[model samples]
Target: AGPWADIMQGPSESFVDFANRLIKAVEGSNLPPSARAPVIIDCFRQKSQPDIQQLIRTAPSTLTTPGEIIKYVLDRQ
Candidate 1:
């Protein structure tokens, strides 16, 4: 909960800043592809967890990059 938790609760100055946080989430993990989504999603705002998760599940096969999955989370209403 140290660095990862900080990423979730981190401040956002711009889209660039948001992307930077995402990079930190997916940076060093050697976990499987499917399991990586939740790890990245966990870096997002607290209330948007399900939104990110559901969107990620929408196209588990296509959501391969950090930008691909996180774009959905950041854009969801």
Candidate 2:
């Protein structure tokens, strides 16, 4: 699959797969937090990973890069 295919389309697998895909997507991208926060959180929310949904929900926008954000969220689990 093309990069971000999973992000553009909702993940076709469970949250664990979605989580792994997201890490790679964020790590591979050059985009900044302002551009990625909504997209990232929306994907998690769509995938029913609400723990991350709420985490990102409360975190300030533009706090960090998507890689850092995703790392923090995943590490919390």
Candidate 3:
């Protein structure tokens, strides 16, 4: 875990809301492109963490970008 992991999903926050904040935080960081997705995924809380992982496992190509990943989760919700 690095500074990227510091951005966490609020307990009562919706996934979409959290995703928005996470994306903004990621953009402000100096992290490289390759680490973006993993960092974003790591920032998710327990409730949605496994779900996102499952989504990745099922349709790996669908979550190419952080923006697309947020929309994917939103579509599923």
Candidate 4:
């Protein structure tokens, strides 16, 4: 229920557009770099499938960048 809650994807918005907005919001927040991924993942989970957590847990450790995370979530949606 943080600022991420306001970064929702619109009904007509593309996943890429939504992801970019989310990335911007996250980067602008005061969260530490280490915390960004989990927050972003949680936000994605709210919009995507319920199994996103499990998928993320098993995902490659290389899933570090915001772009990569967005792509990962988009791929599974």
Candidate 5:
């Protein structure tokens, strides 16, 4: 048989409260306190860990020249 699957224990009452408050702070901050949910049961309504920011990046730079210019420039940088 394969190894046992890991289990995640759901949050405690205090944790749930924290999660709800965090969601409110991040998402529905403008909403009146009365309108907010006691605890955000809807994932979209209060995303705790939302999708990461899509980013664009460039590859590292490279140098090749005489007098070891590349190494010198890179070294003393």
Candidate 6:
């Protein structure tokens, strides 16, 4: 897991709190608009590994920013 994650099968409330602090707020971005429809069509859409593959597909220039990466992952859901 990245940084802190669940211990065994269970989650940590503290982990959730820490994660929330780090999560980028989805405000104005083309990503949300672009991917929301796909998600509504299938909530289970885009399994974890495939999602990483999608980011790799992005243009090298676009991939340079952390916000862009954040947007990519959020939208993939």
How well does each candidate superpose onto the true structure, as a TM-score?
0.40, 0.41, 0.57, 0.63, 0.23, 0.26
- How far residue 41's Cα lies from its native spot in candidate 1, in Å, is 1.5
lDDT of 6 by residue, 1-77 (tens): 22112211113333223223333221222345555343321211222234343543553654544345445556653
lDDT of 5 at 22: 50
Q: Which stretches of candidate 5 lie over 4 Å from their true place?
A: 1-21, 24-28, 44-77
- For candidate 6, the 10 contiguous residues with the lowest summed lDDT are 1-10
Summarize candidate 3's per-residue lDDT along 1-77 as a digit string, tens digits.
55546655556677777677777777678888787777776565332555565764565565656666676777875
Q: Write the per-residue lDDT of candidate 5 for residues 1-77, one digit (tens) a residue.
A: 11111111134323334343455453445555654343222322233222100100111223222223223322442
Each prediction's total of clashing residue pairs, residues at least 3 apart in sequence or on different chains, is 0, 0, 0, 0, 0, 0
Off by over 4 Å in 2: 1-17, 22-42, 45-48
What is candidate 1's CA lDDT for residue 52? 46
Compare the candidates by lDDT and give the number of the best one. 4
Alpha-carbon RMSD, each predicted model: 5.4, 5.9, 3.6, 3.8, 21.5, 12.8
What are the clashing pairs of model 1? none
Model 6 spans with C-alpha error above 4 angstroms: 1-54, 57-61
- Where is model 5 poorest over a 10-residue stretch in terms of lDDT? 50-59
Q: Name the lDDT value of residue 23 in candidate 2.
A: 53
TM match of model 5 to true structure? 0.23
Candidate 1 stretches greater than 4 Å from native = 8-12, 29-34, 45-66, 73-77
Question: What tens digits encode model 4's per-residue C-alpha lDDT throughout 1-77?
Answer: 56777887677776678777887788788899889877776676566433554666677888776568767867875
**Weakest 10 consecutive residues, lDDT, candidate 4?**
45-54
Whole-structure CA lDDT of model 6: 0.34
Candidate 3 is scored at a TM of: 0.57
Whole-structure CA lDDT of model 4 = 0.71
Tens-place lDDT per residue, model 1, 1-77, is: 44455553223245446546655556655666776666665454342345444555665576655666656556753
As a TM-score, model 4 comes out at 0.63
Q: Model-by-model lDDT, in order?
A: 0.53, 0.58, 0.64, 0.71, 0.29, 0.34
